[PDB]
Amino acid sequence: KWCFRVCYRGICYRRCRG
């Protein structure tokens, strides 16, 4: 349910984990 910004080596995408 929690959606957060995920930055993977400069590549950021917003993912909802639950």
Side-chain angles (χ1 to χ4, degrees):
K1 305 185 297 179
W2 185 48
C3 302
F4 59 99
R5 176 180 175 142
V6 187
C7 297
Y8 175 75
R9 287 184 288 133
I11 302 176
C12 307
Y13 41 77
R14 182 275 300 195
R15 296 293 295 172
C16 298
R17 184 62 179 170

PDB file of all heavy atoms in Angstrom:
ATOM      1  N   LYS A   1       0.831  -1.193   0.000  1.00  0.00           N
ATOM      2  CA  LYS A   1       0.000   0.000   0.000  1.00  0.00           C
ATOM      3  C   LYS A   1       0.861   1.236   0.000  1.00  0.00           C
ATOM      4  O   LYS A   1       0.413   2.331  -0.354  1.00  0.00           O
ATOM      5  CB  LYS A   1      -0.882   0.030   1.237  1.00  0.00           C
ATOM      6  CG  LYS A   1      -1.733  -1.202   1.407  1.00  0.00           C
ATOM      7  CD  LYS A   1      -2.688  -1.073   2.583  1.00  0.00           C
ATOM      8  CE  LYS A   1      -1.947  -0.926   3.902  1.00  0.00           C
ATOM      9  NZ  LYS A   1      -2.866  -0.780   5.045  1.00  0.00           N
ATOM     10  N   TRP A   2       2.077   1.076   0.433  1.00  0.00           N
ATOM     11  CA  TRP A   2       2.996   2.183   0.521  1.00  0.00           C
ATOM     12  C   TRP A   2       3.736   2.355  -0.787  1.00  0.00           C
ATOM     13  O   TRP A   2       4.361   1.420  -1.298  1.00  0.00           O
ATOM     14  CB  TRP A   2       3.957   2.003   1.705  1.00  0.00           C
ATOM     15  CG  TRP A   2       4.868   3.175   1.939  1.00  0.00           C
ATOM     16  CD1 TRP A   2       4.512   4.493   1.998  1.00  0.00           C
ATOM     17  CD2 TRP A   2       6.277   3.135   2.192  1.00  0.00           C
ATOM     18  NE1 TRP A   2       5.611   5.269   2.245  1.00  0.00           N
ATOM     19  CE2 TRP A   2       6.706   4.464   2.372  1.00  0.00           C
ATOM     20  CE3 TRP A   2       7.219   2.107   2.277  1.00  0.00           C
ATOM     21  CZ2 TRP A   2       8.031   4.791   2.632  1.00  0.00           C
ATOM     22  CZ3 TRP A   2       8.536   2.433   2.537  1.00  0.00           C
ATOM     23  CH2 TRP A   2       8.929   3.765   2.711  1.00  0.00           C
ATOM     24  N   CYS A   3       3.646   3.531  -1.331  1.00  0.00           N
ATOM     25  CA  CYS A   3       4.259   3.841  -2.587  1.00  0.00           C
ATOM     26  C   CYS A   3       5.421   4.778  -2.355  1.00  0.00           C
ATOM     27  O   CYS A   3       5.259   5.842  -1.741  1.00  0.00           O
ATOM     28  CB  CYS A   3       3.233   4.479  -3.515  1.00  0.00           C
ATOM     29  SG  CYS A   3       1.753   3.453  -3.836  1.00  0.00           S
ATOM     30  N   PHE A   4       6.580   4.393  -2.821  1.00  0.00           N
ATOM     31  CA  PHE A   4       7.772   5.167  -2.593  1.00  0.00           C
ATOM     32  C   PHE A   4       8.652   5.230  -3.830  1.00  0.00           C
ATOM     33  O   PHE A   4       8.503   4.426  -4.767  1.00  0.00           O
ATOM     34  CB  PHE A   4       8.554   4.641  -1.365  1.00  0.00           C
ATOM     35  CG  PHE A   4       9.008   3.199  -1.451  1.00  0.00           C
ATOM     36  CD1 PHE A   4      10.305   2.888  -1.812  1.00  0.00           C
ATOM     37  CD2 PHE A   4       8.139   2.166  -1.145  1.00  0.00           C
ATOM     38  CE1 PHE A   4      10.725   1.572  -1.874  1.00  0.00           C
ATOM     39  CE2 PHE A   4       8.555   0.853  -1.205  1.00  0.00           C
ATOM     40  CZ  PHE A   4       9.848   0.556  -1.569  1.00  0.00           C
ATOM     41  N   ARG A   5       9.524   6.204  -3.844  1.00  0.00           N
ATOM     42  CA  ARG A   5      10.465   6.411  -4.913  1.00  0.00           C
ATOM     43  C   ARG A   5      11.651   5.476  -4.730  1.00  0.00           C
ATOM     44  O   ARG A   5      12.292   5.467  -3.673  1.00  0.00           O
ATOM     45  CB  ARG A   5      10.931   7.870  -4.902  1.00  0.00           C
ATOM     46  CG  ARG A   5      12.007   8.197  -5.917  1.00  0.00           C
ATOM     47  CD  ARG A   5      12.401   9.654  -5.831  1.00  0.00           C
ATOM     48  NE  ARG A   5      13.521   9.965  -6.711  1.00  0.00           N
ATOM     49  CZ  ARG A   5      13.664  11.095  -7.424  1.00  0.00           C
ATOM     50  NH1 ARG A   5      12.746  12.062  -7.360  1.00  0.00           N
ATOM     51  NH2 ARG A   5      14.732  11.249  -8.193  1.00  0.00           N
ATOM     52  N   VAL A   6      11.943   4.711  -5.737  1.00  0.00           N
ATOM     53  CA  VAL A   6      13.017   3.760  -5.688  1.00  0.00           C
ATOM     54  C   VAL A   6      14.070   4.208  -6.657  1.00  0.00           C
ATOM     55  O   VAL A   6      13.799   4.338  -7.845  1.00  0.00           O
ATOM     56  CB  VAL A   6      12.557   2.328  -6.083  1.00  0.00           C
ATOM     57  CG1 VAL A   6      13.676   1.313  -5.866  1.00  0.00           C
ATOM     58  CG2 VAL A   6      11.304   1.916  -5.328  1.00  0.00           C
ATOM     59  N   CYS A   7      15.222   4.506  -6.163  1.00  0.00           N
ATOM     60  CA  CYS A   7      16.301   4.914  -6.996  1.00  0.00           C
ATOM     61  C   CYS A   7      17.348   3.842  -7.033  1.00  0.00           C
ATOM     62  O   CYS A   7      17.953   3.499  -6.017  1.00  0.00           O
ATOM     63  CB  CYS A   7      16.871   6.248  -6.553  1.00  0.00           C
ATOM     64  SG  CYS A   7      15.680   7.624  -6.678  1.00  0.00           S
ATOM     65  N   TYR A   8      17.513   3.292  -8.185  1.00  0.00           N
ATOM     66  CA  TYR A   8      18.423   2.232  -8.428  1.00  0.00           C
ATOM     67  C   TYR A   8      19.500   2.724  -9.371  1.00  0.00           C
ATOM     68  O   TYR A   8      19.273   2.864 -10.569  1.00  0.00           O
ATOM     69  CB  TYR A   8      17.660   1.051  -9.020  1.00  0.00           C
ATOM     70  CG  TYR A   8      18.513  -0.112  -9.454  1.00  0.00           C
ATOM     71  CD1 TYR A   8      19.073  -0.985  -8.534  1.00  0.00           C
ATOM     72  CD2 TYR A   8      18.753  -0.333 -10.799  1.00  0.00           C
ATOM     73  CE1 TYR A   8      19.852  -2.042  -8.949  1.00  0.00           C
ATOM     74  CE2 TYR A   8      19.519  -1.378 -11.218  1.00  0.00           C
ATOM     75  CZ  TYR A   8      20.069  -2.230 -10.297  1.00  0.00           C
ATOM     76  OH  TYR A   8      20.849  -3.266 -10.727  1.00  0.00           O
ATOM     77  N   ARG A   9      20.633   3.069  -8.795  1.00  0.00           N
ATOM     78  CA  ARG A   9      21.802   3.574  -9.527  1.00  0.00           C
ATOM     79  C   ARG A   9      21.480   4.799 -10.379  1.00  0.00           C
ATOM     80  O   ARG A   9      21.993   4.962 -11.495  1.00  0.00           O
ATOM     81  CB  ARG A   9      22.484   2.474 -10.343  1.00  0.00           C
ATOM     82  CG  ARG A   9      23.264   1.487  -9.495  1.00  0.00           C
ATOM     83  CD  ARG A   9      23.993   0.472 -10.353  1.00  0.00           C
ATOM     84  NE  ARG A   9      23.088  -0.508 -10.972  1.00  0.00           N
ATOM     85  CZ  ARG A   9      23.113  -0.880 -12.263  1.00  0.00           C
ATOM     86  NH1 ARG A   9      23.906  -0.265 -13.130  1.00  0.00           N
ATOM     87  NH2 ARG A   9      22.339  -1.874 -12.676  1.00  0.00           N
ATOM     88  N   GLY A  10      20.648   5.659  -9.840  1.00  0.00           N
ATOM     89  CA  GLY A  10      20.300   6.879 -10.518  1.00  0.00           C
ATOM     90  C   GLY A  10      19.001   6.781 -11.269  1.00  0.00           C
ATOM     91  O   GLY A  10      18.431   7.797 -11.670  1.00  0.00           O
ATOM     92  N   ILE A  11      18.537   5.569 -11.472  1.00  0.00           N
ATOM     93  CA  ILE A  11      17.281   5.326 -12.140  1.00  0.00           C
ATOM     94  C   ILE A  11      16.195   5.283 -11.089  1.00  0.00           C
ATOM     95  O   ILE A  11      16.154   4.363 -10.275  1.00  0.00           O
ATOM     96  CB  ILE A  11      17.300   3.973 -12.901  1.00  0.00           C
ATOM     97  CG1 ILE A  11      18.449   3.941 -13.921  1.00  0.00           C
ATOM     98  CG2 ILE A  11      15.954   3.716 -13.588  1.00  0.00           C
ATOM     99  CD1 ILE A  11      18.600   2.613 -14.630  1.00  0.00           C
ATOM    100  N   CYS A  12      15.359   6.269 -11.070  1.00  0.00           N
ATOM    101  CA  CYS A  12      14.309   6.311 -10.090  1.00  0.00           C
ATOM    102  C   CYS A  12      12.968   6.016 -10.713  1.00  0.00           C
ATOM    103  O   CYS A  12      12.635   6.522 -11.797  1.00  0.00           O
ATOM    104  CB  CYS A  12      14.254   7.650  -9.369  1.00  0.00           C
ATOM    105  SG  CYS A  12      15.830   8.194  -8.617  1.00  0.00           S
ATOM    106  N   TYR A  13      12.230   5.194 -10.045  1.00  0.00           N
ATOM    107  CA  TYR A  13      10.889   4.835 -10.412  1.00  0.00           C
ATOM    108  C   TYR A  13      10.065   4.722  -9.145  1.00  0.00           C
ATOM    109  O   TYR A  13      10.613   4.449  -8.080  1.00  0.00           O
ATOM    110  CB  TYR A  13      10.872   3.528 -11.244  1.00  0.00           C
ATOM    111  CG  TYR A  13      11.833   2.440 -10.765  1.00  0.00           C
ATOM    112  CD1 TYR A  13      11.551   1.652  -9.665  1.00  0.00           C
ATOM    113  CD2 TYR A  13      13.026   2.208 -11.437  1.00  0.00           C
ATOM    114  CE1 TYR A  13      12.420   0.669  -9.245  1.00  0.00           C
ATOM    115  CE2 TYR A  13      13.903   1.226 -11.025  1.00  0.00           C
ATOM    116  CZ  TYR A  13      13.594   0.461  -9.928  1.00  0.00           C
ATOM    117  OH  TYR A  13      14.461  -0.517  -9.507  1.00  0.00           O
ATOM    118  N   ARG A  14       8.793   4.976  -9.228  1.00  0.00           N
ATOM    119  CA  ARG A  14       7.944   4.919  -8.065  1.00  0.00           C
ATOM    120  C   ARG A  14       7.234   3.580  -8.022  1.00  0.00           C
ATOM    121  O   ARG A  14       6.567   3.187  -8.978  1.00  0.00           O
ATOM    122  CB  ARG A  14       6.984   6.129  -8.043  1.00  0.00           C
ATOM    123  CG  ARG A  14       6.048   6.233  -6.826  1.00  0.00           C
ATOM    124  CD  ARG A  14       4.776   5.419  -6.999  1.00  0.00           C
ATOM    125  NE  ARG A  14       4.034   5.883  -8.156  1.00  0.00           N
ATOM    126  CZ  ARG A  14       2.763   5.599  -8.450  1.00  0.00           C
ATOM    127  NH1 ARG A  14       2.065   4.739  -7.713  1.00  0.00           N
ATOM    128  NH2 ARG A  14       2.198   6.162  -9.505  1.00  0.00           N
ATOM    129  N   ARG A  15       7.397   2.877  -6.935  1.00  0.00           N
ATOM    130  CA  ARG A  15       6.826   1.559  -6.791  1.00  0.00           C
ATOM    131  C   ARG A  15       5.946   1.507  -5.575  1.00  0.00           C
ATOM    132  O   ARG A  15       6.198   2.200  -4.581  1.00  0.00           O
ATOM    133  CB  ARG A  15       7.931   0.504  -6.674  1.00  0.00           C
ATOM    134  CG  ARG A  15       8.798   0.366  -7.903  1.00  0.00           C
ATOM    135  CD  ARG A  15       8.039  -0.197  -9.088  1.00  0.00           C
ATOM    136  NE  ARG A  15       7.595  -1.576  -8.864  1.00  0.00           N
ATOM    137  CZ  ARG A  15       6.777  -2.254  -9.671  1.00  0.00           C
ATOM    138  NH1 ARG A  15       6.197  -1.649 -10.694  1.00  0.00           N
ATOM    139  NH2 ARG A  15       6.499  -3.525  -9.419  1.00  0.00           N
ATOM    140  N   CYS A  16       4.913   0.737  -5.661  1.00  0.00           N
ATOM    141  CA  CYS A  16       4.034   0.530  -4.561  1.00  0.00           C
ATOM    142  C   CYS A  16       4.249  -0.846  -4.007  1.00  0.00           C
ATOM    143  O   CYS A  16       4.007  -1.854  -4.676  1.00  0.00           O
ATOM    144  CB  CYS A  16       2.581   0.742  -4.968  1.00  0.00           C
ATOM    145  SG  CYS A  16       2.208   2.446  -5.537  1.00  0.00           S
ATOM    146  N   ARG A  17       4.757  -0.893  -2.815  1.00  0.00           N
ATOM    147  CA  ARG A  17       5.008  -2.129  -2.155  1.00  0.00           C
ATOM    148  C   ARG A  17       3.875  -2.350  -1.184  1.00  0.00           C
ATOM    149  O   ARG A  17       3.870  -1.810  -0.074  1.00  0.00           O
ATOM    150  CB  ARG A  17       6.364  -2.083  -1.437  1.00  0.00           C
ATOM    151  CG  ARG A  17       6.789  -3.385  -0.777  1.00  0.00           C
ATOM    152  CD  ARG A  17       6.966  -4.506  -1.788  1.00  0.00           C
ATOM    153  NE  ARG A  17       7.405  -5.747  -1.142  1.00  0.00           N
ATOM    154  CZ  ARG A  17       7.471  -6.951  -1.733  1.00  0.00           C
ATOM    155  NH1 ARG A  17       7.125  -7.097  -3.008  1.00  0.00           N
ATOM    156  NH2 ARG A  17       7.881  -8.008  -1.039  1.00  0.00           N
ATOM    157  N   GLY A  18       2.884  -3.057  -1.633  1.00  0.00           N
ATOM    158  CA  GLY A  18       1.715  -3.252  -0.841  1.00  0.00           C
ATOM    159  C   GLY A  18       0.802  -2.063  -0.979  1.00  0.00           C
ATOM    160  O   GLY A  18       0.110  -1.921  -1.991  1.00  0.00           O
TER     161      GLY A  18
END
